[PDB]
Write a protein that binds this DNA or RNA. Structure first.
Lengths: 129, 143, 150
RNA sequence: GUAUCUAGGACUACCAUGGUUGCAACGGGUAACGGGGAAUCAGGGUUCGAUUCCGGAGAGGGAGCCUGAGAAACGGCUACCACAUCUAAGGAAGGCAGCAGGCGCGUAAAUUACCCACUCCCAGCUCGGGGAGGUAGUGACGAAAAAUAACAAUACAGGACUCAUAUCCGAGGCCCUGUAAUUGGAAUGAGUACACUUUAAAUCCUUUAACAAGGACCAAUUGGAGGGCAAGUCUGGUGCCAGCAGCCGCGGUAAUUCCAGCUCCAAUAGCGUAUAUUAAAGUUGUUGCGGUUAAAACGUUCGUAGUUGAACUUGUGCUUCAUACGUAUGUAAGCGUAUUACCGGCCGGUACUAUUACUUUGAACAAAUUAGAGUGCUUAAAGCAGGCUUCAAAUGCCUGAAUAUUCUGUGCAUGGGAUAAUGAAAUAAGACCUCUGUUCUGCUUUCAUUGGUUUUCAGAUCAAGAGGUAAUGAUUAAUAGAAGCAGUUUGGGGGCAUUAGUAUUACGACGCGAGAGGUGAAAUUCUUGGACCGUCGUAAGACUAACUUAAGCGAAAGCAUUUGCCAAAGAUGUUUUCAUUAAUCAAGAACGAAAGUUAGAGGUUCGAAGGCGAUCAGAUACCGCCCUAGUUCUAACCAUAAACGAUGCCAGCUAGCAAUUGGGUGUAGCUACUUUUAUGGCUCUCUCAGUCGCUUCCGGGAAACCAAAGCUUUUUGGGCUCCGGGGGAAGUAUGGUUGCAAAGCUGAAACUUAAAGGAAUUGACGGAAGGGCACC
RNA sequence: CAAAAGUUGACCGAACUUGAUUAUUUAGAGGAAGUAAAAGUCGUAACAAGGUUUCCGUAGGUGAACCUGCGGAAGGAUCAUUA
């Protein structure tokens, strides 16, 4: 059954990034997906994505750019306090310079470089670099 | 593939490892602990013994020599040992049926060289420290 | 993907987008409440009211022209079945293979099927108890099951 | 109820039948005192904690009990057991797991010293007491600091150097560098000891007058020199001996490993050896392993436990300022309003609130340890002291004795509402802020004191209206799932009935003749007039050819004559229904080729075993003949296979091209003739569900290869279950459990060992094909 | 008045005979395996078409490796055309 519905947009972006596609058709559009790509959109790792609506679940057609390498998804959502947030930024993020760990804190989905500013902690969602 | 990757499966993850460290061949001397069963001394480091013979253990192939070992009965438990005396000579320092401090043989349970299945090593015979006898750095007890 | 037999296919009915439409349909929400009562009094299931309201009359979808479903209409007019239709035909199948077998023994397939269709019963007799559509203390027995088809 | 200080099945009495567990009860093990903490790596971790602090227990064993506030006390008593002592024989007395000792045990642990001066305890007590505590001797467990020379010309050569001269070459050579039992200059403290100090006293250190080095002296060792792995192809000896050696290997008469000598290297008051442990070990793996072939996916599917489960339910706008710099935007408020009832001067204090998980900030909780800021103990490990114009008077205030983490974790407060579960309004609650009751339950104040009589009030709760404006209340129908359906079907799917087909054996007859069968060659074996052959005929049991496929169906095992029946099923078609019903699964359950077993039938061919005939050096084999159990059908048992795709299952993605089974669809195709037609066929086009091949990665892999064995990325994450940890021993031994039994499932270790294994290359134009030569 | 030795009975209950079970260690005629393994005897089973392709399940038999029967598989000596 379709277990993790965040996850296989990120294995359809990453899979279709590698072959170098320019547009990507996700299915079926969580509002955690759109909150995730908007985090990937403020940093320009993604185009402007359009949500072709059904009355079923939603479908997204995403425009790809070609700036990113890997969007993954940390299943299960491990509970990540602020103190062990640094543990993950060594692991998932390939340099201290760039890269992002998206996590759901309670004050809205933000990456670690916002939640380490707003002093929030939450559960982890995914990453990208 | 494989692991119970949920978030509420730390019961399966600990009961699996608990059941699968038995197949870690060297962590079955934490679990089954045969030290008091199969080791010639009951888990100690050294052992005082009393020499019974002078066994000329011949060398295994493809090396020919004769290793000149010694068959100890201990005093700790009444097990039996075939120990070993190194560094040529020093069977002349045995003065048979007089006590011996045998020791482990440095491969932690196996015979080492061309010696077939002999797992020990004399370190003191009549309390005079055999490494201080090839130089004869101390006097051998003779009378 | 076909939960008891390992073909993986897909077919279905596909609803179109516009839930509001048609506008030309001359049949209103009032008379279908009568016509479902007209057809459901002949003991048809909610499915076979739908496929004859669809072909002959013919309304596309009853949820669109009326703010209820076909089953939820039939409860509101006192036409409630004692056992719902999915558990019916899965019981009614399970009583045939339990009738073919008592004469034709030596058929391991119909033994294996009746395992596969009594297992679908006790998982859907189990969902119908949490949603309380059928009461608790309800174990489908394989003996008395013949009497609840006719 | 009794007992106790007290609750309490603590115990008695009656009465109830409860409690507990796959979320591991109960029993077993422990070389188990629990914690603080210790060891060790980057993290994650493993391992240890008898041991100074806290809590607990015990004083040879068990039991008992007095005094007391407090003891089930043992430097109290009472028995008994064990051990043991003095006994004049009647009796009496024993308890070092307090200190220092002694015996034992063992690889393994200090002196029968001094003192209450310290810390504190105790009594009647300022004083007494205190082998607590402190001092000392012992003490390479350990940790820190640091002595073995320093300097000088010649020296003896290297080298620059000035320069001759240059593939050479020397000298002015010289900052240098060494060698110099050459020469010195000797610089100092281990010694050394007056006297000091320290101390309860004494010692140790620190101060210290005197005393103290040409090495021979005040004199470093311990391991090694094949590789790993730092450092001799040095000499002699020994010649598969002695030995070395963790591993791989040296020695078999020129040893880079042995015994040495010279040398040399590594650390150095330290070094080797053993067992243990940790890191190396992504070889226990949550981060983070592996399972096609190296070890490793259950034979199959069903399925509770468990784990894991799609989407959707207040979000940016609009205006301003604080605010980065025309702009920006990160700001608060106004405004699509419970931005919340009140009184206060936008402001206090109040009236007043669906949870949980997670998260923020707090509280709470011993130090020691650890992390650590402060501090020149001569430095350092430590310690918690210590600074200071005071220079000539000290009055000279304080720094301090922080701060967070192992006191993890639970638990308790508070901020948030993303994520995540639960929760409402469908056999009935949509409400009314409510004058409210058309219930009545009342309940205390004034009737100075107090009530019989009843109203206000009704603090109230529950009936309660038809004080019913009510948008009145039911999310989408997942390319999730189950269900339905002129459906149209399709298929060696399943069961039973029905029958067919040649053939094989047998038997009959008819005819013809003597050889027939079999092999590499025979023989066993069959047959005179009739085998084999021919022929027609009868009986039988078995098997379903050809069609036959990279074709189908099935959960796997498996599944082929016709037909009738019988329930079943995938796929497609579906503006049908239901609305998460799902995924995967320990235990459990059904099915399971062949062989085998129990009973009943049948019994053609084949045929384990058996007997022959050969073959062979032998042949209990291959080949040849005879056949028996078996093969076959119903009734059960067995529960395995190279049960293989050596590839668990559900989901998504990432590319062509060719076929190809079903079903759908368009011919802007042919063709059939029933007719130009229409049903049927074919071709073309598209689409599901696929399956099989190739082509390639422009993905992976050790490769062979794989469109999954890919997206397992750089320390990776879609769920879920089963399984592997060098090779043997060994699927053995033993226990449990199933079977009529064969056997099946569970299932070790002692011991042994350094390789065993995977894939691929190059060696046989060495007993394999296809070539091509010559009179060794 | 108080009170000893004695004493009745309940209780706590050492201890010792028994009966049992548990956990351990051990002796044993005989028997049957494993490993050492190097040099013995007999055969030649496997690796080449290892001279009967090899293996698997089961069943019987044989001095021994092994052989035979029924059903699998290729890890084969065939990825197969050849109308």
């Amino acid at each position: 059954v379709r277990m993790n519905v965040l996850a296989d947009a990120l294995k359809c972006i990453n899979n279709a990034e590698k072959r170098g596609k320019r547009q990507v058709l996700l299915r079926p559009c969580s509002k955690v997906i759109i909150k995730f790509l908007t985090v990937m959109m403020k940093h320009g790792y993604i185009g402007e994505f359009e949500i072709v609506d059904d009355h079923r679940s939603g479908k997204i057609v995403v425009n790809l750019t070609g700036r990113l390498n890997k969007c993954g998804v940390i299943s299960p959502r491990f509970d990540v306090p602020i103190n062990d947030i640094e543990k993950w930024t060594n692991n998932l993020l390939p340099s201290r310079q760039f890269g992002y760990v998206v996590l759901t804190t309670s004050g809205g989905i933000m990456d670690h470089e916002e939640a380490r500013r707003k002093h929030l902690g939450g559960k982890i969602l995914g990453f990208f670099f | 593939m494989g692991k119970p990757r949920g978030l509420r499966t730390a019961r399966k993850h600990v009961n699996h490892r608990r059941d699968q460290r038995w197949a870690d061949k060297d962590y079955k001397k934490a679990h089954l602990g045969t030290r008091w069963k199969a080791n010639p001394f009951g888990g100690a480091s050294h052992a005082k013994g009393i020499v019974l013979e002078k066994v000329g253990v011949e060398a295994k192939q493809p090396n020919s020599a004769i290793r000149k070992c010694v068959r100890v009965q201990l005093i700790k438990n009444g097990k039996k040992i075939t120990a070993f005396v190194p560094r040529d000579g020093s069977l002349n320092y045995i003065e048979e049926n007089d006590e011996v401090l045998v020791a482990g043989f440095g491969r932690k349970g196996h015979a080492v060289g061309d010696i077939p299945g002999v797992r020990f090593k004399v370190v003191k015979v009549a309390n005079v420290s055999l490494l201080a006898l090839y130089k004869e750095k101390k006097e051998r007890p003779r009378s | 993907g076909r939960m008891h037999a390992p073909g993986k296919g897909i077919s279905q009915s596909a609803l179109p987008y516009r839930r509001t439409v048609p506008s030309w349909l001359k049949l209103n929400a009032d008379d279908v409440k009568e016509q479902i009562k007209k057809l459901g009094k002949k003991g048809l299931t909610p499915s076979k009211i739908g496929i004859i309201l669809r072909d002959s009359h013919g309304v596309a979808q009853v949820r669109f022209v009326n703010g209820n479903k076909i089953l939820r209409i039939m409860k509101s007019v006192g036409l409630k079945p004692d056992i719902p239709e999915d558990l019916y035909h899965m019981i009614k199948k399970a009583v045939a293979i339990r009738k073919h077998l008592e004469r034709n023994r030596k058929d391991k397939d119909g033994k294996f099927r009746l395992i596969l269709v009594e297992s679908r019963i006790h998982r859907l007799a189990r969902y119908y108890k949490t949603k309380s559509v059928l009461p608790p203390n309800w174990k489908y027995e394989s003996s008395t099951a013949s009497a609840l088809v006719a």
